Design a protein around this ligand. Structure first.
Ligand SMILES: CC(C)(C)n1nc(-c2ccc3ccccc3n2)c(C(N)=O)c1N
Length: 464
């Protein structure tokens, strides 16, 4: 057996995706950088058997297309799967789109042509994505002209998706109705693409509602419309492609390959001809609102989740250190701190950033440096615990504030109760529950909260 950490060292965390964390890693010999998705066997159940997973992996490694993330290697130990792929640095498509001041049907067609081209290739090799959405579209690099790379093609077949809301935010909008009912094939990827296109040209989901379940009720019915004012600025051709992608009965829905030949793709991807090409201003602003809402809901859930974890780990670490403290004096040396923190990791296993003993020792050392000023030999286990854990939550509280500021586009310092309803609907926190909480934070509020109040609401909503 090949051992992942014998070949790769973790450099830093890139982000969190479907099925687990993605870590930027480096080959210890060749210096090659790679993005490694680390799938925790305890958090993510397998749908297929080992034999079937190894065959898919072997096939995925041999496929190459400019719009599909490249998979290089695959490893498995006792606790995890490690999927080693190429690293891309351009970020999510929609986060790039919202930074633009101009965006036209030509831009949307360039985008969707890449996606269809990647999908067409994968379907020829009988691989289905199933969970296609804007988050799965990454830009190769931060350059303006960057290609799209679809991530996670094929994983849904072998791993069961999380039922935690923090993991399924913005999933409901894109799922094909046949996937909900159980009989699906590769045409589900065209539907998801169709939803994405609708969003690109209007900035609003064709199937929408106040919570995950209302969205699904709309998807399952299959009915949508083009009556938004900003569709008047959109070519008839584009709407026609959309109708064909969003056709309810999958045998009647256009194939990926045929969608590539559609008049709209043929017309608006000719690099020269701007026969009539206005900028879709309302769309871009709707997308910016959509995206800020999604990101703030997501950051709010991860904030709560991080706060629940830190309650768990603080108490567990303290009990581990307490038992290691044979003196009873409350002190421990470095190796013991390392030993208990590893004992924590052995139990916790939510920390893919700590891929080997080398990772642990350095985290401990960051904290021993952090104990303000240093006496070597006898360390107050109590303070190390506070600092180790504050460290763990940083990314998530800091991210929460950032996302609040980004959602507050007029810099008003506040979010309205109408806005709270939209955020909490997307986060799937019941309506009665969040108002009761507000009422307790600020008994006099007048339909808006500042950042501190919102944060206090989140703490109450996770039992603090
Ligand atoms: C941190 C975010 C933006 C969510 N991310 N995710 C990936 C990614 C996503 C899925 C992967 C599956 C197998 C191997 C590598 C994978 N890498 C990835 C990448 N490969 O560059 C990247 N930048």
């Amino acid at each position: 057996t090949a051992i992942f950490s014998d070949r790769y060292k973790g450099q830093r965390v890139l982000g969190k995706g479907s099925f687990g964390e993605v870590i930027l890693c480096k080959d210890k010999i060749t210096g090659q950088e790679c993005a490694v998705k680390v799938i925790s066997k305890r958090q993510v159940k397998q749908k297929t058997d080992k034999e079937s997973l190894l065959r898919e992996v072997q096939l995925l490694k041999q496929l190459d297309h400019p719009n599909i993330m490249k998979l290089y290697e695959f490893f498995e130990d006792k606790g995890y799967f490690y999927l080693v792929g190429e690293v891309y640095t351009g970020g999510e498509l929609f986060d790039e789109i919202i930074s633009r001041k101009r965006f036209s049907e030509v831009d949307a067609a360039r985008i969707i042509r890449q996606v269809l081209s990647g999908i067409t290739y994968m379907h020829k090799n009988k691989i289905v994505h199933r969970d296609l959405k804007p988050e799965n579209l990454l830009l190769e690099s931060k350059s303006k002209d960057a290609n799209i790379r679809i991530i996670d093609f094929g994983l849904s077949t072998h791993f069961e998706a999380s039922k935690k809301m923090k993991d399924k935010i913005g999933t409901a909008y894109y799922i094909a109705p046949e996937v909900l009912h159980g009989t699906y094939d590769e045409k589900c990827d065209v539907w998801s693409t169709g939803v994405i296109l609708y969003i690109l040209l209007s900035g609003c989901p064709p199937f929408n509602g106040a919570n995950e379940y209302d969205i699904l009720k709309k998807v399952e019915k299959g009915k949508y419309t083009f009556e938004l004012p900003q569709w008047k600025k959109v070519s008839e051709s584009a709407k026609d492609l959309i109708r064909k992608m969003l056709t309810y009965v999958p045998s009647m829905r256009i194939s990926a390959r045929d969608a590539l030949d559609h008049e709209w793709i043929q017309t608006y991807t000719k690099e020269q001809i701007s026969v009539d090409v206005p900028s879709l201003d309302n769309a871009i602003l709707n997308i910016r609102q959509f995206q800020g809402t999604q990101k703030l809901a997501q950051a709010a859930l991860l904030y709560m989740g991080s706060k629940l974890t830190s309650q768990d780990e603080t108490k567990e670490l303290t009990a581990i250190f307490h038992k290691m403290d044979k003196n009873g004096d409350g002190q421990l040396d470095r190796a013991e701190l390392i030993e208990g923190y590893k004992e924590l990791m052995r139990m916790k296993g939510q920390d893919a950033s700590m891929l080997d003993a080398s990772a642990v020792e350095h985290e401990v050392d960051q904290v021993l440096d952090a104990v303000d000023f240093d006496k070597n030999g006898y360390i107050e286990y109590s303070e190390f615990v506070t600092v180790a854990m504050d460290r763990k939550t940083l990314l998530s509280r800091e991210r929460l504030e950032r996302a609040f500021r980004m959602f507050d586009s007029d810099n008003s310092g506040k979010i309205s109760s109408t806005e709270l309803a939209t955020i909490f609907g997307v986060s799937d926190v019941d309506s009665e529950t969040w108002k009761s909480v507000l009422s307790e934070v600020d008994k006099n509020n007048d339909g808006e909260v500042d950042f501190d109040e919102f944060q206090q609401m989140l703490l109450k909503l996770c039992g603090n």
